[PDB]
């Protein structure tokens, strides 16, 4: 569980993210597709995009990023009482996209990386630590939902 102070740090940095959701989205996907190459395989409209400028020029990928970071953002803003919008997400990533928790760890890693890259001044130790707790909670709860729909990845 997070303290109110931690939630404030999470949402402080997220409002910075919201100055440019689209560019953070691109950075986050490109970083994740590159540090953990198994991940880009799940997206099959994007795997004819074999270089960074190709990734950044794809409006499809960009829209996708916005969609993703918009869902994440709405989750973080509920400060843990996120069952209602976590449920549709687990339904898709568990029974269609089949994304294991490990992959959710890898994208959580990329998010943290991009946040530190773009917002050092706003992403110091306590802020990193709070964002990690928030993403950790998200993965705990989505894992529980995953199992309720079956599939223990
Ligand atoms: C912070 C965790 C993430 C969030 C908030 C997120 C959110 C979303 C959203 C909102 C959509 C569009 C609607 C839907 O089908 O659910 C989506 C689609 C998708 N996501 Fe995720 N996602 C997460 C992580 C992942 C990762 C780690 C994988 C890949 C390793 C992945 C792969 C997919 C795929 C394959 C689609 C379908 C794309 C389509 O054809 O539009 N997601 N995601
Ligand atoms: C979803 N990425
Ligand atoms: Cu994606």
Curated annotation (Swiss-Prot):
Domain Globin: 1-147
GO function terms (MF aspect): heme binding; metal ion binding; nitrite reductase activity; oxygen binding; oxygen carrier activity; peroxidase activity
Enzyme Commission designation: 1.7.-.-, 1.11.1.-
Protein name: Myoglobin
Residue positions binding O2: 64
UniProt entry keywords in alphabetical sequence: Cytoplasm, Heme, Iron, Metal-binding, Muscle protein, Oxidoreductase, Oxygen transport, Phosphoprotein, Transport
Residues bearing the modification Phosphoserine: 3
Lineage, uppermost ranks: Eukaryota, Metazoa, Chordata, Craniata, Vertebrata
Source organism: Physeter macrocephalus
Classification via Pfam families: Globin (PF00042)
């Amino acid at each position: 569980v997070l303290s109110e102070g931690e939630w404030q740090l999470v949402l402080h940095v997220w409002a910075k993210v919201e100055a440019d959701v689209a560019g953070h989205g691109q950075d986050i996907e490109i970083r994740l597709f590159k540090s953990h190459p198994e991940t880009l395989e799940k997206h099959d409209r994007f795997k004819h995009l074999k270089t960074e400028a190709e990734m950044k020029a794809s409006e499809d990928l960009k829209k996708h990023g916005v969609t993703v970071l918009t869902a994440l953002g709405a989750i973080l803003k509920k400060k843990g009482h996120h069952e209602a919008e976590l449920k549709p997400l687990a339904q898709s990533h568990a029974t269609k996209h089949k994304i294991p928790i490990k992959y959710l760890e890898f994208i959580s890693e990329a998010i943290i990386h991009v946040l530190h890259s773009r917002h050092p001044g706003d992403f110091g130790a306590d802020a990193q630590g709070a964002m990690n707790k928030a993403l950790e909670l998200f993965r705990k709860d989505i894992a529980a939902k995953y199992k309720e729909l079956g599939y223990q990845g």
